[PDB]
Design an enzyme around this catalytic site. Structure first.
Site, PDB file in Angstrom:
ATOM      1  N   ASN A  31       3.433  -4.908   6.216  1.00  0.00           N
ATOM      2  CA  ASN A  31       2.313  -5.797   6.380  1.00  0.00           C
ATOM      3  C   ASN A  31       2.773  -7.215   6.953  1.00  0.00           C
ATOM      4  O   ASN A  31       1.630  -8.091   7.037  1.00  0.00           O
ATOM      5  CB  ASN A  31       1.446  -5.701   5.123  1.00  0.00           C
ATOM      6  CG  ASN A  31       0.064  -4.669   5.374  1.00  0.00           C
ATOM      7  OD1 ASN A  31      -0.052  -4.705   6.639  1.00  0.00           O
ATOM      8  ND2 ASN A  31       0.042  -3.961   4.378  1.00  0.00           N
ATOM      9  N   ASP A  76      -3.806   7.820   9.366  1.00  0.00           N
ATOM     10  CA  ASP A  76      -4.256   6.547  10.439  1.00  0.00           C
ATOM     11  C   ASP A  76      -3.564   5.682  11.306  1.00  0.00           C
ATOM     12  O   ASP A  76      -3.466   4.735  11.347  1.00  0.00           O
ATOM     13  CB  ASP A  76      -5.155   5.666   9.475  1.00  0.00           C
ATOM     14  CG  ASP A  76      -4.238   4.720   8.750  1.00  0.00           C
ATOM     15  OD1 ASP A  76      -3.187   4.997   8.379  1.00  0.00           O
ATOM     16  OD2 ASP A  76      -4.715   3.615   8.389  1.00  0.00           O
ATOM     17  N   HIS A  99      -0.515   4.583   7.127  1.00  0.00           N
ATOM     18  CA  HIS A  99      -0.590   5.468   5.631  1.00  0.00           C
ATOM     19  C   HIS A  99      -0.352   6.968   5.696  1.00  0.00           C
ATOM     20  O   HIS A  99      -0.512   7.487   6.723  1.00  0.00           O
ATOM     21  CB  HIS A  99      -2.054   5.039   4.828  1.00  0.00           C
ATOM     22  CG  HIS A  99      -2.156   3.568   4.667  1.00  0.00           C
ATOM     23  ND1 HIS A  99      -3.464   3.335   5.067  1.00  0.00           N
ATOM     24  CD2 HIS A  99      -1.552   2.673   4.369  1.00  0.00           C
ATOM     25  CE1 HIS A  99      -3.374   1.808   4.565  1.00  0.00           C
ATOM     26  NE2 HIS A  99      -2.327   1.577   4.269  1.00  0.00           N
ATOM     27  N   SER A 133       0.688  -1.153   0.130  1.00  0.00           N
ATOM     28  CA  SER A 133       0.028   0.087   0.008  1.00  0.00           C
ATOM     29  C   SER A 133       0.785   1.451   0.009  1.00  0.00           C
ATOM     30  O   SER A 133       0.506   2.271  -0.708  1.00  0.00           O
ATOM     31  CB  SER A 133      -1.127   0.027   1.191  1.00  0.00           C
ATOM     32  OG  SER A 133      -1.187  -1.119   2.008  1.00  0.00           O
ATOM     33  N   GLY A 144      -1.939  -4.098   1.308  1.00  0.00           N
ATOM     34  CA  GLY A 144      -2.012  -5.253   2.129  1.00  0.00           C
ATOM     35  C   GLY A 144      -1.157  -6.330   1.508  1.00  0.00           C
ATOM     36  O   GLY A 144      -1.174  -7.636   2.458  1.00  0.00           O
TER      37      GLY A 144
END
Lengths: 218, 310, 218, 310
Positions: C100, C188, C191, C43, C70
């Site tokens: 991830n 968040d 990201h 991502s 992901g």
């Protein structure tokens, strides 16, 4: 008793406790900000803030964005129930949740949203609510394009009961004739591009503006 | 000794981590101070722009700032509900003042540098003794959030500002209130008193055979007034969003203004006109100040910068 | 035999077959495009394209973006293994994966990246490779900020072996003194925001341009 | 009868769903055609701009387009490795021609409207009989991808363009090649022949006591060549990325170009100076077209738009 409408906090399984981090941030935002417009929901809502079009359209509206990625109806509920609806008295609330609700039938999902709406106009009777419809997904047609569509259907029917709510089921040309969604509209066939949101936001903004121009003594 | 309010920004100071709440010029030194949701007070150099110092010690947010006459004490305000008094020997906090039950969104040192005034979501205005940190007087009044308090050049009077769409002028000694100014349509966010230019009467000087104040609201309206009569006299019919700062120029030629319309306005109450506009920021302008002596204006917003103007 | 370095395609559990849709788009891209620069990874990579800074910096470089959200080392591997490395002969390749890979020890994850690097300079011997280090995450300090840190550690030591690779361990002020990450930099706490990418991309672009200015007869 | 190459775009046609690949003017009607990665050929109205028609039927991408003299047949090119021939009675496809084993990236109808030329990743140039769809000659040559082919006013000659950084000029009848033009530094993307303007000599006409073509490249540089000698003649060093399109103005006053630097440039090869610059699009510009008679050029780019400039 419908599972999609039972409030439920997302357990962090990863280690960095990011979900709670964000929720807190919002609670904190609810304590001393005072918005006219409130967006709640999942990634669709969250991602909207990241694009140039948010500072262009909603920023001047005094808007808050309580979106979390990958949230389901159950999660948004819990969030709303645990203090994302206190102290603030927004004029308009935009709800956009559901497309992450794998594990529930269309019907259940609609129930979820409906419960959300119910809660909202309980804690915020003054607020006029817009519910954005679920958007298509996936490159080529599939079970989920169908699911979301049903949800929209049931909502068109069940939302004109229930006070101060309307469904806005936008459709920009996200599916063409051959039934394909262009990755210029959905870069991963789910989340929107700058371009995409512009197709959604134009009408959304236009509506909110209407609803705001309705009554201004708060 | 006419003045230049304009060009394109001649210094943009980044450094805060969060919206700026108030900007303030020092009475003496070539330095200016800024508050933020940081919760930090920061000190520049407006002639040069330099991170000079940072003042730490608030818990939640810094909403207001006010220097004493001498430029030796600085009071601050926060969402901790405190009112920190700082020493400009450079560093330390002196006292922390506790009273308000909620957000404290305005503070001011009174002219006889012996008292502090504050205002809160309390719906309260409190008066503190500088050298004892005692709360001395509490003004019960508006039914809602109080947003700003200002002394009267003479020290005798206080102007408050609130969510009940009202402007109150209180007598600091008696705690009675000479006026409630009512004709605003939405929350009032701003107050300034008029100085060395009560000449301004000219624009509305009839009637038959006084003290004044501006109010900026979320009407997008700045309203001129006199307390004496209770009549507003003007309404600067303005730009596009919540108004956030008001400011009579050094003399009384112009009123300066900034608001959520990402913009800084210089009006010509020289007969109502609005003589110039500058888009100053990439998100709401939160506040301003004009220097009483030098050719500089500061301006802080939500894009977390402090902009200096010539 | 370390699990993080065994290639393996992500099974679709949702229904819209989105992962394979994207992979195909890439292979299709591989068939008839011809880039100088190639971004592969998770991502972090994929989201970069969505911000204005992409069209300002890397678009004119003739760059392709093979990022999937992901994705783990194992997936990126498989994707490269099954044809995202054919026909094209990029001059520079940017690899950015790992954050991830919960379920893997940092050691394992380092192994994963190394495996990817190995593969690339097997299939693409002329390409000079940049590996972006893993960034911090989470509002407040946690086991993950620690994990990625180790990965970076191990990579600093392991990559100067192996042909045509360097690690680019950027650090913009993502963590401040009190050890918090501002959501103005990570919306968040994972990201990046527009702002965030700018802290990352400035240096990255600056390096690529170097590496491209190195040799141009392809 | 001088000409205006400039303003700000006076028609922007949106409609394709993907990069535009080639833009083309019709020889008679007030209409212009565009191809894309769509994979569709679309038809506007440049006078008015109207989605007139869409021509569908390729599988993968349409990379070139070419009208016959009369403007009644249109050939197309694609990554299906097809060469569809279309009828401008308005709709139907007439033949589909199969041969190349890979991408076909350019096509042209020859003057004597009785053959088609194409070029491919094949490393090949093939010549098709229009009315039988047969492949008739195949030119083996460069060691890499062939990017473009153009006939010679006369029909007698063929100009190829490729990834081996080379331009070849072939004899259409003997399949020998008169010239290999070597001195480009990187892939060549473009070719055009010079028309009614062999006066151009002027700028380089000494030596002691001919046909001319331009190459456009990933050099970012456009060359001029005189083939009979095979010397490069000029080298217009201009803008900032790969060169995608290359034209001679109806006269021969100027040279127009376009490239991967969101740009269309007018070249005054009188004194090697680049006389103007339009930033035309917000992502690469793929192809342009001047109109031998009336005042327009068209421009298609990866932003999926075709623009009509006066």
């Amino acid at each position: 008793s419908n599972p999609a409408a039972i409030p439920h906090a997302a357990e962090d399984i990863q280690g960095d406790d990011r979900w709670m981090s964000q929720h807190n941030r919002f609670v904190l935002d609810c304590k001393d900000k005072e918005p006219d417009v409130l967006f709640v929901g999942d990634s669709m809502v969250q991602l909207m803030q990241q694009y140039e079009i948010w500072r262009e359209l909603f920023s001047p509206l005094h808007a808050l964005n309580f979106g979390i990625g990958g949230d389901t109806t159950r999660h948004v509920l819990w969030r709303l129930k645990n203090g994302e609806l206190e102290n603030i008295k927004p004029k308009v609330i935009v709800v956009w949740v559901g497309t992450n609700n794998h594990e529930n039938t269309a019907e259940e999902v609609a129930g979820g949203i409906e419960a959300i709406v119910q809660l909202i106009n309980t804690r915020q009777p003054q607020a006029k609510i817009i519910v954005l419809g679920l958007l298509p997904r996936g490159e080529k047609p599939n079970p989920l394009r169908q699911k979301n569509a049903k949800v929209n259907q049931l909502l068109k029917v069940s939302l004109p009961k229930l006070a101060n709510v309307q469904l806005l089921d936008t459709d920009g040309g996200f599916v063409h004739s051959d039934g394909a969604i262009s990755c210029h509209d959905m870069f991963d066939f789910l989340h929107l591009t700058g371009g995409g949101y512009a197709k959604i936001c134009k009408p959304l903004h236009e509506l909110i503006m209407q609803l705001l121009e309705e009554t201004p003594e708060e | 000794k006419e003045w230049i309010p304009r060009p394109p920004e001649k210094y943009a100071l980044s450094g805060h981590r969060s919206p700026v709440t108030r900007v303030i010029f020092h009475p003496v030194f070539s330095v200016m101070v800024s508050a933020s949701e940081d919760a930090t007070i920061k000190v520049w150099d407006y002639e040069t722009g330099d991170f000079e110092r940072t003042l730490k010690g608030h818990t939640d947010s810094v909403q207001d700032i006010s220097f004493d006459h001498s430029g030796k004490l600085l009071a601050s305000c926060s969402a901790d509900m405190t009112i920190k008094l700082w020493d400009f020997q450079g560093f330390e906090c002196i006292r922390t003042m506790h009273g308000h039950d909620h957000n404290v969104s305005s503070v001011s040192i009174m002219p006889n540098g012996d008292h502090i005034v504050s205002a809160s979501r309390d719906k309260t205005i409190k008066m503190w003794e500088v050298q004892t940190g005692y709360c001395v007087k509490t003004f019960t009044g508006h039914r809602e959030w109080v947003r700003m308090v200002r002394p009267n050049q003479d020290g005798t009077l206080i102007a408050s500002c609130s969510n009940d769409q009202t402007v109150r002028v209180w007598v600091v000694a008696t705690k009675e209130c000479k006026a409630e100014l009512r004709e605003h349509r939405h929350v009032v966010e701003c107050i300034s008193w008029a100085p060395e230019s009560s000449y301004s009467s000219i624009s509305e000087a009839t009637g038959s055979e006084g003290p004044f104040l501006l109010s900026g609201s979320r009407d997008k309206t700045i309203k001129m007034w006199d307390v004496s009569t209770g009549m507003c006299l003007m309404t600067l019919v303005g730009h596009d969003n919540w108004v956030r700062g008001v400011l009579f120029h050094s003399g009384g030629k112009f009123i300066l203004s900034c608001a959520d319309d990402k913009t800084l306005r210089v009006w010509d109450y020289k007969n109502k006109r609005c003589m110039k506009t500058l888009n100053a920021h990439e998100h709401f302008v939160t506040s301003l100040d004009f220097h009483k002596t030098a050719p500089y204006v500061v301006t802080g917003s939500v894009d977390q910068t402090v902009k200096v103007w010539e």
